[PDB]
């Protein structure tokens, strides 16, 4: 018996209010504090009741140790530390909290102030009661929502972001909003540059959309394995841009250009960032009233 039960919380409103403030102040940057949320909410799989933000299992192992993982993990110390500090919500509460404020950031540094709806209520998991074993199992072979590609393989990179949208339920035009925002916001795994179309990387802006449909680029492999592309001005020959597949299908993927044109430019800055909110929180809250 490790004897005592876990705090029950009962967050309000001005608990919330202080936990963005001492977040907002931490020091942690718009990449890290979205990457830390969605390495939480992004587990999720429909049918399984495994995966999803509650419990704050990527506090735990093994998720805290997945490669995938490694970036979202150097924030977790500074939001385990104001967790402890605050006592009135749970790490996992705090940790999609997180991912709130980060988007925000984004968005005013955008000159936006939207507001990210934030649904608390989220308890921690103990890691005796989080089988090692079974949890191993969702480790993701790609998250092409952060660029992430383990063991090439027989299957396709753009195959497995198709399957990890499913995964999460995500609607085309919500893939989209989500993929173009996350590279933007520095979401890459491993702070590559490939996807990133902008210089102002933490603004949550449209411009992978506006650089990824620009006409003046014309896109090549770099070699025979065909899983990395340079986009080259087309008067200059000069490379300007990097990509995955897993970027590049929104432009190659006739279907998927069509959802992705829409937000490809302007005056259409705020519709992205309206679509962009509403989809990360329907990933945030996923493990929330979960019918299967």
Do not use: C
Request: aromatic share 8%.
């Amino acid at each position: 018996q490790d004897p005592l039960p876990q705090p029950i919380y009962n967050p309000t409103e001005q608990d919330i209010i202080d936990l963005k403030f001492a977040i907002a102040d931490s020091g942690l940057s718009v990449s890290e504090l979205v990457s830390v949320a969605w390495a939480s909410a992004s587990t999720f799989r429909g049918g399984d009741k495994r995966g999803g933000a509650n419990g704050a299992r990527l506090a735990l192992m093994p998720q805290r140790d997945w490669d995938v993982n490694a970036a979202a993990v150097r924030a977790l110390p500074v939001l385990e530390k104001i967790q402890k500090e605050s006592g009135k919500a749970s790490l996992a509460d705090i940790i999609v909290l997180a991912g709130v404020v980060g988007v925000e950031k984004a968005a005013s540094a955008a000159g936006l102030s939207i507001h990210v709806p934030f649904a608390p209520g989220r308890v921690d998991a103990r890691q005796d009661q989080t089988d090692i074993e079974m949890f191993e199992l969702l480790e993701p072979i790609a998250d092409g929502f952060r660029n992430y590609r383990a063991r090439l393989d027989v299957s396709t990179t753009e195959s497995l972001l198709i399957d990890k949208a499913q995964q999460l339920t995500l609607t085309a035009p919500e893939m989209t909003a989500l993929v173009g925002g996350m590279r933007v916001l520095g979401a890459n795994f491993d702070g590559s540059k490939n996807g990133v179309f902008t210089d102002r990387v933490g603004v949550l802006s449209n411009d992978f959309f506006v650089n990824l449909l620009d006409m003046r680029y014309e896109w090549k492999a770099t070699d025979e394995s065909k899983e990395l592309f340079e986009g080259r001005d087309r008067e200059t020959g000069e490379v300007k841009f990097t990509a995955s597949r897993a970027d590049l299908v929104f432009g190659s993927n006739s279907v998927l250009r069509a959802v992705a044109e829409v937000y490809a430019s302007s005056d259409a800055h705020e519709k992205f960032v309206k679509d962009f909110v509403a989809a990360w929180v329907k990933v945030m809250n996923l493990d929330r009233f979960d019918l299967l």
